Design a protein around this ligand. Structure first.
Ligand SMILES: [Fe+2]
Ligand SMILES: [Fe+2]
Ligand SMILES: [Fe+2]
Ligand SMILES: [Fe+2]
Lengths: 124, 124, 124, 124
C-alpha cells in the first residue's frame, strides 16, 4: 500500500502537515492549503516542498475527485549556485472550487526529502 | 517556433487572456492569475482551462524561472456523464513568491480546445 | 486518510489498476507503467486516465521519493465537440531512473471519474 | 512575449535542446524526447532538467494540443544533503499518441537554472 509512505500528524508540532482551511461563499468554496503554518518549513535548493494537491470526496459518493494541483517550482537555484537566485515559491496553495455538495477535503503534499504528507477536513 | 501556437490579447475583449495582478508585501510578492476576469470562460467537461503557469525573468538576467504551476482538474465529469458531478475548479491561480528582485512576470495558460495563451506584466 | 479513496486490485480483472514492469541495466532502471493492459481503458473526453506517478522507497529507508509524473493530456476534445479531434494520449508511462539501490516501486494513477488507483512491485 | 525567454538551437552543439524522435505504428505515434542525447546533461540537486512537454498542431488547424507532460522529480536530494540519495530521474520522456493526423510536434523543456528550451519536428 502506498499509504505506508504517507505521513500525517498534528500540524502544531509537525511542520510538514498540510493545513487546510476554507471559506464557502455561495456556490464558491475557497480553499487554502499550506505547509508550515505554525512551524515554518525550509525552502532551499536542497530542501523544499514541491507541491500540494487537493482532493474532494462528496458525502456518500464512491469516487474521489482531484480538485487541483499546485507546484512550487522556484527554490533559489541559479547559475551562481544553490540558494542564490533570491527567487523562492512558498508552499501556499489556493483553490477556488465551485460546488454545492458537502463531503471531505484531502490535501496531499510532497517534500523533496521527507516524502509524502496528508491531512483532511470535513467540508460542511 | 512554439510561439506560433501561443496567442495573446486584451482581456477586456478576449476571455482566454490570463490576467496577472500582484501585491508586494515586504520580500513577499502575492500574485493572482485568472482566465475569464471580464468575459467568463466556460468550465465544462468538454471545454475548460486546464492550468496556469507563472514565470519570472528578473531585470537584467538571462534565464527565466518558473515560479509555479496550478492545474485545475475538476470539470463536472462523473460516472453519470459529463457535467454531472457539480464539482468544478475555477481558473484562478495564486502564487506566493519570495523575492526582492524586480523584473517581468509571465503567465501561460492552456485551454483544452483553444490552445496556449499568454500575458505578462512588469514586477516593480 | 486519503488511502480510503485509493483502490487496488489485480490488473487481470480491473482494467484500471496500473501495471508496473521494469528492466534493470546496470545503474539504469527503465520502468513502464500502464493502465488497461488486459482490457483497454476508455479514453474519451468524458472518461479517461489523467496521469500516472511513480514512487520509490529504497530498502530500509523511511522517506519515499517521487521518481516521476506523466500527464496524458489529449482526449479527443476540440472546437467541434467531445471526441472529434482524433488526438488521444494513451495511458502508458515510461520512467528512466538512475539508481543502484533496491526497494519498492509504487504507481499511483488517477481516472477522471473513477478516483485514484495504486499498485506496487519490488525492485530487485 | 514569453518566447523571448525560450531558447532553441542545434542539439548536436547545445546539450540543452530537447531532441524529438518518433515512430508511426498505424494509428499509434510513439514519441521520444530527450535532453542530453549528444551531450549528456548534468542531473544534480543544483542543476537539472525539470520536465519535458509535447505539443501537437495538426496540419491546417488553428489550435495546438498539449499531448503530454513528463516531470523528472528525483535529483539526488536526501536528508543527508544534496546528491546523496543515489536516486535520479533521467530527462527522457516517452509519449504514446493515438492519431491519424499529420502536423507539427513541439517539445518544451525547462532546466532549473537555464530557463526554457524548445524544438520541433514535422509529424508525417
Ligand atoms: Fe522536509
Ligand atoms: Fe476556450
Ligand atoms: Fe475509469
Ligand atoms: Fe542547464
Amino acid at each position: 500500500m502506498i499509504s505506508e509512505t504517507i505521513r500525517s500528524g498534528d500540524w502544531k508540532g509537525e511542520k510538514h502537515v498540510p493545513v487546510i482551511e476554507y471559506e464557502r461563499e455561495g456556490e464558491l468554496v475557497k480553499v487554502k492549503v499550506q505547509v508550515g503554518k505554525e512551524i515554518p518549513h525550509p525552502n532551499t535548493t536542497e530542501h523544499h516542498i514541491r507541491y500540494i494537491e487537493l482532493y474532494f470526496l462528496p458525502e456518500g459518493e464512491n469516487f474521489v475527485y482531484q480538485v487541483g494541483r499546485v507546484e512550487f517550482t522556484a527554490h533559489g537555484e541559479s547559475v551562481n549556485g544553490p540558494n542564490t537566485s533570491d527567487v523562492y515559491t512558498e508552499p501556499i496553495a489556493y483553490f477556488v472550487l465551485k460546488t454545492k455538495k458537502k463531503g471531505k477535503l484531502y490535501a496531499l503534499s510532497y517534500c523533496n526529502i521527507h516524502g509524502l504528507w496528508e491531512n483532511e477536513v470535513t467540508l460542511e
